[PDB]
């Protein structure tokens, strides 16, 4: 769900950036309410996420080449499909008669992603799909082997569609360098609700702004709100405004004319107690961007996994059920506490 910025520099159109949307316009409230948002952590609305807000997908392509061992036109023992007489149980659920997978099929690690038969071993083998993230088949392409043609097309490009909903840990940022990880997906009933009846899509903590000094975001908030109400895009090109002609006064006048508070505030009520909050909360429309990185792509757990032959110590590799290294500094720290059994 790509969206055109309300607040934008006019050069955005000059480069036709609307052909490739990079974010979405979100109702952002500068509020410290949940208690889970603080400095590097921000809150996303549950009901917003449930409605497809900031939803993304990730496509991965694999090349299954049967020229891996054969070279210089050697006779081939291998061939896409299934060999007669030998057939291990329930493989037909993922692959079609040709040995290639059905485009649209759900696959998990261990499931067969393709099927072939090599004459050298006289057995029907399969190339397994292996990744922590399950996928669906988006595209399967069969490719001619060239090499003076003649030979059957073993070769093949398979595209995986991995659905990626916003997870706790995923980074989100405004166009002002204010990035924060998703601390929690807060429910709309528990979310603070505006006088208008709107609950923010994203919650940014007010303690982020005094150190970063991202006032561009503050003016973006009252500009985005003004443009959403009146239905007009605003120019946010640098040095357009002056010390005499302030944007806070410009969009402030626009906000007052529409029927809202001049200083971009809104009277909000608590989602828990239901009572009106102490003061009016700073709410607006800010263009937010979802960063591509998973929060913990490096998320791992090992009880007792494989070990190297020489050292007989846990082997390196997250996906390989590898061990976490306790280096010299952690050794030093365990000596530090005088905690000899923890070191042992």
């Amino acid at each position: 769900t790509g969206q055109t910025p309300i607040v934008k520099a006019n050069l955005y159109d000059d480069y036709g950036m609307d052909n490739f949307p990079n974010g979405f316009n979100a109702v952002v409230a500068v509020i410290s309410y949940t208690g889970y948002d603080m400095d590097d952590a921000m809150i996303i609305n549950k009901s917003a996420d449930e409605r497809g807000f900031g939803y993304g997908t990730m496509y991965k392509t694999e090349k299954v080449d049967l020229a891996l061992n054969r070279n210089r036109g050697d006779p081939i023992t291998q061939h896409f499909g299934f060999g007669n007489d030998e057939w291990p149980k329930e493989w037909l659920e993922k692959l079609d008669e040709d040995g290639l997978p059905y485009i649209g099929t759900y696959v998990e690690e261990g499931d067969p992603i393709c099927a072939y038969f090599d004459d050298t071993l006289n057995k029907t083998k399969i190339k397994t799909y292996h990744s922590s993230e399950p996928a669906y088949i988006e595209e399967v392409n069969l490719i001619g082997d060239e090499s003076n043609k003649f030979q059957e097309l073993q070769t093949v490009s398979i595209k995986y569609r991995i659905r990626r909903t916003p997870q706790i840990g995923d980074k989100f940022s405004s166009r002002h360098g204010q990035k924060g990880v998703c601390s929690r997906k807060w429910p709309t009933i528990d979310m603070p609700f505006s006088e208008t009846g709107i609950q923010p899509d994203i919650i940014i903590n007010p303690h982020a702004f005094p150190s970063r000094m991202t006032i561009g975001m503050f003016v973006e908030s009252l500009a985005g709100k003004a443009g959403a109400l009146h239905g007009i895009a605003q120019d946010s090109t640098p040095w357009i405004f002056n010390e005499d002609d302030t944007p806070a006064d410009y969009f402030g006048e626009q906000l007052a004319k529409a029927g809202y508070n001049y200083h971009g505030n809104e009277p909000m009520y608590s989602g828990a107690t239901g009572e009106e909050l102490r003061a009016d909360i700073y709410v607006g429309v800010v263009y937010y961007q979802r960063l591509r990185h998973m929060v913990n792509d490096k998320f791992q757990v090992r009880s007792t996994g494989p070990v190297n032959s020489l050292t007989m110590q846990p082997v390196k590799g997250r996906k390989r059920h590898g061990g976490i290294r306790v280096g010299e500094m952690e050794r030093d720290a365990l000596i530090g506490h005088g905690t000899s059994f923890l070191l042992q």
């Binding site: 690690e109 261990g110 292996h130 996994g305 059920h321």
Partner: peptide, 27 residues
């Protein structure tokens, strides 16, 4: 075939992270 006092029965099953006998024990 493992060869343990126990009897494997063939059909060894690979578990990612754990290779176990379909039956009694797991390496």
């Amino acid at each position: 075939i493992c060869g343990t006092d126990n009897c494997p029965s063939r059909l060894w099953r690979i578990i990612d992270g754990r290779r176990t006998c379909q039956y009694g024990h797991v390496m």
